[PDB]
């Protein structure tokens, strides 16, 4: 439960990017990567583009859920989210941070992007105050993950469970109740 705990995680994901110099002073780091050639895109984890874009080395354009129309349609797809909805990579609220930090110095339209995603994040979390006004009666055996994303549940992780324990002291005897 942290700001960079996810960033120990989410940037592990890997996507096709462009390098604009070829293989480095060494040729290839062994691992899933293949070596590098300018003008030839390469898929990598995303904790190098730090050391490219801040290094003034090469560009990148994103995945396709990272665009306008698909998310300008998911904005109405989640009408079904009386449980949950479509999940484009389930971390588009963390990657977009570091993407839109330094990438959009050259990217088109980093804004409607930003607009909708904030227009999607908290609103999916309003669900998570409201659907909690459905939660009653010691429902340990009722919960919801079915298309939950990655970045949200931490924001309730520390609180209610460390409450619900010394509730759960009460959640055999005679007619009265017991804990």
């Amino acid at each position: 439960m942290d700001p960079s705990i996810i960033e120990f995680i989410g940037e592990k994901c890997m996507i096709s990017i462009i390098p604009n110099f070829s293989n480095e002073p060494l040729h290839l780091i062994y691992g899933p990567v293949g070596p590098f050639r300018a003008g030839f895109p390469v898929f990598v984890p995303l904790w190098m583009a730090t050391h490219l874009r801040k290094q003034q080395k090469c560009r990148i354009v994103p995945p396709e859920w990272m665009d306008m129309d698909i998310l300008e349609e998911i904005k109405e797809e989640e009408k079904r989210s009386k449980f949950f909805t479509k999940m484009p990579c389930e971390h588009y609220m963390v990657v977009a941070q570091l993407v839109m930090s330094t990438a959009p110095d050259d990217v088109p339209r980093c804004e409607e992007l930003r607009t909708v995603i904030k227009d999607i994040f908290d609103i999916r979390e309003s669900k998570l105050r409201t659907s909690i006004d459905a939660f009653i009666k010691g429902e340990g055996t009722y919960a919801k993950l079915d298309n939950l994303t990655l970045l949200e549940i931490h924001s309730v992780r520390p609180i209610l469970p460390y409450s619900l324990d010394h509730i759960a002291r009460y959640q055999q005897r005679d007619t009265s109740m017991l804990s």
């Binding site: 942290d2 009653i136 924001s155 992780r157 010394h166 009265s176 804990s179």
Partner: protein
């Protein structure tokens, strides 16, 4: 030896004045070798935390805020009742108390108050709630930088 507590000298030391069925012998701390059936007998808990509740020494009795007279309407008045800091151990008296008085009736009440918090702290965006309250503020205050360096 405990699910420990900050006030282990105010933890089991809040005091009640239960009456008496039978005689007494030599209280020691008090003005005492024999006293009456039925008396305002000040009783700070701990020695009677396991002192033979079934025995003919003491009776059904409550400090009456903890009696139904407040609380059994504080379950109907469970709507905007305030508690402040008053009788503090009020999520937790019964965690010991409830059967020990042996009026078999008030186990529901405290739960009935505090399970309300499943729909109190939506709008959140005693000496025990303090911890989780601090935490509730804190985690969001740092989720703030979970956005960015901000």
């Amino acid at each position: 030896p405990n699910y420990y507590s900050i006030e282990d000298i105010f933890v089991t030391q809040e005091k009640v004045e239960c009456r008496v069925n039978t005689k007494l012998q030599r209280m020691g701390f008090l003005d005492s070798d024999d006293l009456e059936p039925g008396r305002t007998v000040n009783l700070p808990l701990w020695y009677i935390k396991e002192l033979k509740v079934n025995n003919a020494y003491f009776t059904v009795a409550v400090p009456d805020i903890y009696r139904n007279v407040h609380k059994a309407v504080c379950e109907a008045e469970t709507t905007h009742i305030e508690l402040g800091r008053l009788h503090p151990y009020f999520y937790e008296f019964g965690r010991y108390l409830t059967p020990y008085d042996r009026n078999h009736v008030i186990g529901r009440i405290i739960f009935e108050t505090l399970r309300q918090r499943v729909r109190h702290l939506l709008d959140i965006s005693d000496n025990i709630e303090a911890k989780l309250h601090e935490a509730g503020v804190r985690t969001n205050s740092q989720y703030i930088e979970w956005l960015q360096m901000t």
